[PDB]
Write a protein that binds this ligand. Structure first.
Ligand SMILES: COCCOc1ccc2cc1OCC(=O)N(C)CCCN(C)Cc1c[nH]c3ncnc(c13)N2
Length: 330
């Protein structure tokens, strides 16, 4: 395009100085910083190099592009008309950067390592020819897993499920979207002053009581969508390890997706979104713990309705089917 830029292009000194690490994986470090008084999240991925990072080869640009494309398409839903949702993490910009890792980022990396501990290599070995993709996203808050003991009540749980269901439905309708890896580390929660959140599905607008939280979906490692019959997806048909996990219902969902799609990952099977929503519902009922339990009639009723959702939702064919037809959302 206009060639790689230096890190200073995306992260000028003041923005670098305000970086705090907030997350990691094999193929991405994520930092929070502040620009124009506003928090943002910065995801940085080393690309195109020959050598190992975090135990695996670096993605090429062509290998990571699908996930950037998916990010952008889902972000763009916030500005659409017939199918509109703000429930995917908003993408502000994408740059290809060249250079050694900024010493100021290493300081932030070290602080996270000392306090939370890292599975990753200390990123101090990259040379001045190293390419990276730097993605700036809106700040989404903290993941659901990390909020295990932090939510107010099962009313909050209902809002979260409703938000996720609406977002996935809008994406099914617009993009024939499947998330395919929507475990509780990929659902982000942040405070909102809005009492109700707004979405539009096939031209019909409606609202969701927020309970003070806004949900953002993240991580498109395994996601699938299409436009004009061009399908963007991660082909895991030859992956062995993804389907052999144990110890958590999460790992059954990979197997159940493979059963549903006959190991054909290019196809559209929006049932996979139902499977993830059931897994999240299961987490809400079994692993989340709330500050206020259902100590009244109205609250014991919400508990009952979420229990019924758990028992019935797998008989729906899509997030769209669930949103439009399930008694929980009436
Ligand atoms: C090619 O990229 C496609 C988009 O993928 C992502 C966008 C935004 C993300 C995470 C994304 O993928 C997963 C990933 O990179 N991790 C390091 C694991 C999760 C780290 N989170 C939870 C850190 C986090 C906390 N508050 C946030 N506010 C916004 N975005 C965040 C985070 N992460």
């Amino acid at each position: 395009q206009k060639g790689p830029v230096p890190f200073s292009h995306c992260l000028p000194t003041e923005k670098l100085q305000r970086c705090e690490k907030i997350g990691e994986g094999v193929f991405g470090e994520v930092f929070q910083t502040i620009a124009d008084h506003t928090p943002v999240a910065i995801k940085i991925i080393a690309i195109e190099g020959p050598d190992l990072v975090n135990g695996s080869h670096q993605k090429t640009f062509e290998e990571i592009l699908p996930e950037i494309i998916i990010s952008k398409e889902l972000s763009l839903l916030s500005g659409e008309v017939c199918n509109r949702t703000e429930g995917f993490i908003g993408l502000n910009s994408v740059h290809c950067v060249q250079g050694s890792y900024p010493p100021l980022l290493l300081k932030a990396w070290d602080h996270y390592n000392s306090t939370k501990g890292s599975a990753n290599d200390r990123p101090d070995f990259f040379k001045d020819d190293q390419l990276f993709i730097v993605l700036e996203f809106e700040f989404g808050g903290i993941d659901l897993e990390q909020m295990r003991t932090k939510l107010s009540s099962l009313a909050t749980a209902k809002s979260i499920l409703h938000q996720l269901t609406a977002s996935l439905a809008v994406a099914e309708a617009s993009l024939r979207f499947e998330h395919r890896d929507l475990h509780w580390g990929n659902v982000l929660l942040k405070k909102t002053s809005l009492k109700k959140l707004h979405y539009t599905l096939n031209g019909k607008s409606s609202t969701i009581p927020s309970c003070g939280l806004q949900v953002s979906i993240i991580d498109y490692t395994l996601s699938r969508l299409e436009r004009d019959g061009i399908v963007v997806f991660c082909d895991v048909s030859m992956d062995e390890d993804l389907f052999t996990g144990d110890g958590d219902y999460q790992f059954d969902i990979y197997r159940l997706m493979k059963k549903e799609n006959n190991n054909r990952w290019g196809e559209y099977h929006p049932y996979s979104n139902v499977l993830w929503l059931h897994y999240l519902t299961d987490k809400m009922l079994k692993q989340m713990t709330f500050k206020t339990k259902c100590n009244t009639p109205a609250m014991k009723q919400i508990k009952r309705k979420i229990q019924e959702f758990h028992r019935t939702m797998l008989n729906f064919s899509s997030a769209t089917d669930l949103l439009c037809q399930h008694s929980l959302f009436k």
